[PDB]
């Protein structure tokens, strides 16, 4: 009889169009075959959706709505260029997210929503915009790093999830080490928090990361600090200010919970 089902209707229509005409538009071809593949692989929709499915109690519905609105603002800020207003909006959103009780009660929900990735990506955009010109919008990088460190400290699983991006944080490490009053709010601090007091993560830490940190420390011990000498500091031949930060990270890398990770 008739199709009687959206799956059958789409599967017939896509093939009929494709065999009727040679589709010129690659986007049209992709859309057609994506629909056909989705219709044929019905179980794939479930295997993709279920990981992003969370159930909440009825009492916390309004707080979940508020947290979702804040996260929507944060995600929407990914599509706009940085500015003073964007800085203010993200401080708003991050403060509200921190104050929300769901942020302390459902860590799996926040991991599934992928807000640590969103905050990291925004901080990445900020850092990549004017990376050489010191650090533009220091409050964005500081608040992003503080929120990310708090995310690591909330739960061990959150710490592992953030540790999964430790590699890139290391290329984005040498950003705000020299400037004081921002201590504890740099991507190096975020990496240290991801590896802090976790034997699994310390053991899984790879040699190339330590080599990167060692090269940074060697550079700081070899050449002076451009920002400090530009502000007028005496031109000693090396950079104790950043060398101390790198040594502090290496301390957490090597030492964990009273014992020393020999590897």
């Amino acid at each position: 009889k008739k199709s009687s089902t959206l799956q059958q209707l789409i599967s017939e229509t896509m093939v009929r169009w494709a065999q009727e005409s040679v589709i010129e538009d690659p986007e049209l071809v992709r859309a057609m075959f994506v629909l056909l593949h989705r219709q044929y692989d019905g179980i794939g929709g479930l295997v993709r959706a279920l990981p992003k499915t969370y159930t909440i109690n009825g009492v916390s519905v309004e707080d979940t709505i508020n947290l979702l609105a804040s996260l929507g603002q944060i995600r929407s800020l990914l599509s706009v260029r940085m500015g003073k207003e964007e800085e203010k909006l993200m401080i708003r959103g991050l403060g509200d997210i921190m104050n929300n009780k769901v942020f302390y009660q459902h860590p799996n929900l926040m991991r599934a929503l992928g807000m640590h990735e969103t905050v990291m990506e925004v901080m990445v955009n900020v850092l990549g915009g004017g990376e050489s010109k010191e650090i533009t919008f220091p409050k964005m990088v500081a608040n992003c790093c503080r929120f990310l460190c708090y995310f690591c400290r909330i739960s061990r699983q959150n710490q592992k999830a953030m540790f999964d991006h430790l590699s890139y944080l290391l290329e984005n490490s040498s950003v705000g080490l020299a400037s004081p009053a921002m201590r504890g709010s740099t991507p190096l601090d975020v990496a240290a928090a991801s590896v802090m007091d976790n034997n699994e993560l310390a053991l899984a830490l790879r040699e190339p990361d330590l080599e990167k940190v060692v090269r940074y420390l060697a550079g700081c011990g070899l050449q002076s600090c451009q920002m400090l000498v530009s502000k007028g500091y005496p031109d000693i031949g090396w950079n104790p200010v950043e060398g101390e930060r790198y040594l502090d990270f290496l301390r957490f890398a090597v030492f964990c919970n009273g014992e020393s990770v020999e590897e």
């Binding site: 599509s79 706009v80 260029r81 500015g83 207003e85 964007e86 915009g129 004017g130």
Partner: protein, 434 residues
């Protein structure tokens, strides 16, 4: 030449430079659309490699100094005064070709458009001059569409110069495209540029075309065509009266239209003069019509406020009496028997006059033309004659559309050609000389 060496001593390879620029344009010519996908991709790869090699050898800069050394002279005549006259003609062509060369060198290449950011400010400083505006605009468009980094240095002054390009060089869609590229690049919106473009372009309402939704206005007139001329039998004073039976102040969002008065034809033709056949134009929107809306005297699309006891816009059960004096050009009104404190004077009396009313939707009015057709609720002023007395004897007084075309079935519509002049309107007796 700048150091003022003798023209004979200075050797400008003008012909070779132009020919090489043409060769370079052909060498960096983009792939054609009709080509197959594989050949297109191969030629795009070759173009990308050529652009990388040129930029790495620093050809972008060399083109920049060539452009600067050409702009040290103001015009082609000036360059022909300094250098040779043949170089004077070739100055425009070389200057254009260099700009197309720069555009082809940087087009679609992220690295080149990124390195062009430093000179981007220098590029926009010559956008105002006419000899290079098109090439500079094309290069600017390529840089903006390709390099996100270039948008980070565009400032308020740079945007205002681009808008002044609209202001001075007229309407152009390419600069609008450049502005859109400034607003959005690669799916990321720059709020600063959006706000500046908005606040610097929109409020003026002097460059972009403006749009507004306007009610249709139709004009209705009697058959009479009264005028004044030497040695002809027409009474120079006339009077008619209009009653408003119902009026909706706002049938739509826009205010309703209701104006009454007199209109004058151009010459002795029967057409109303100086006004569009259809649109939102009514009585008083041209210099051939003279209207009254209850608060303003309308003529030439400009309104003057007139005082009247308990003045108000024309409502239901409002009576307007119109008076015309062609002995000394004068148009006076009387609302509800009360005289309005203003009149039209010393207008043009070359053509014929007739009563006219202009309205939008939601209007229900009645002409009181006097005598058989109606009775005046107010006594006519002394001398003034009722308007029905001007009807030619055989014809019948009819209130018909002032304009030719009305709402009717499409294929039954009567297309009307030019009409003849009403020489019969002014019966001027001309006996032969004896």
């Amino acid at each position: 030449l700048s150091k003022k060496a003798k023209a004979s001593t200075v050797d400008l390879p003008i012909e070779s430079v132009s020919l090489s620029l043409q060769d370079l344009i052909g060498y960096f010519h983009p792939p054609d659309e009709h080509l197959e996908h594989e050949d297109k991709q191969n030629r795009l790869r070759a173009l990308k490699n050529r652009q990388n090699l040129f930029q790495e050898e620093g050809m972008i800069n060399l083109v920049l100094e060539c452009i600067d050394r050409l702009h040290v002279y103001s015009s082609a005549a000036h360059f022909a005064d300094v250098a040779g006259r043949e170089a004077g003609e070739s100055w425009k062509s070389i200057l254009n070709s260099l700009y197309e060369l720069l555009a082809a060198l940087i087009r679609g290449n992220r690295k080149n458009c990124a390195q062009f950011s430093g000179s981007l400010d220098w590029l926009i400083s010559r956008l105002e001059r006419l000899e290079a505006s098109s090439g500079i605009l094309e290069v600017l468009h390529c840089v903006l569409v390709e390099s996100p980094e270039a948008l980070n240095i565009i400032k308020e002054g740079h945007i205002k110069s681009i808008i002044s390009l609209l202001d001075k060089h007229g309407r152009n869609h390419k600069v609008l495209d450049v502005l859109c590229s400034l607003c959005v690049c690669h799916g990321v919106a720059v709020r600063s540029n959006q706000h500046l473009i908005c606040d610097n372009l929109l409020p003026g309402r002097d460059l972009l075309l403006q749009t507004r939704l306007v009610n249709h206005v139709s004009s209705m007139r009697p058959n009479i065509f009264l005028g004044v001329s030497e040695g002809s039998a027409q009474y120079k004073k006339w009077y008619y009266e209009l009653m408003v039976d119902h009026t909706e102040p706002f049938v739509t969002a826009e205010a309703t239209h209701l104006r009454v008065g007199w209109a004058s034809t151009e010459g002795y033709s029967p057409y109303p003069g100086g006004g569009e056949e259809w649109g939102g134009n009514g009585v008083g929107d041209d210099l051939f019509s003279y209207g009254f809306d209850g608060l303003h005297l309308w003529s030439g699309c400009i309104a003057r406020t007139v005082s009247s006891p308990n003045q108000h816009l024309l409502r239901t059960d409002d009576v307007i009496s119109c008076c015309l004096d062609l002995s000394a050009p004068s148009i006076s009104f009387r609302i509800n028997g009360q005289p309005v404190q203003g009149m039209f004077e010393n207008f043009n009396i070359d053509g014929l006059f007739f009563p006219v009313v202009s309205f939008s939707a939601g209007i229900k009015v009645r002409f009181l033309l006097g005598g058989r057709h109606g009775e005046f609720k107010f006594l006519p002023p002394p001398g003034y004659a009722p308007c029905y007395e001007a009807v030619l004897p055989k014809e019948k007084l009819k209130v018909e559309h002032s304009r030719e075309y009305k709402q009717e079935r499409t294929y039954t519509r009567d297309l009307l050609g030019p009409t003849v002049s009403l020489t019969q309107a002014a019966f001027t007796p001309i006996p032969v000389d004896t």
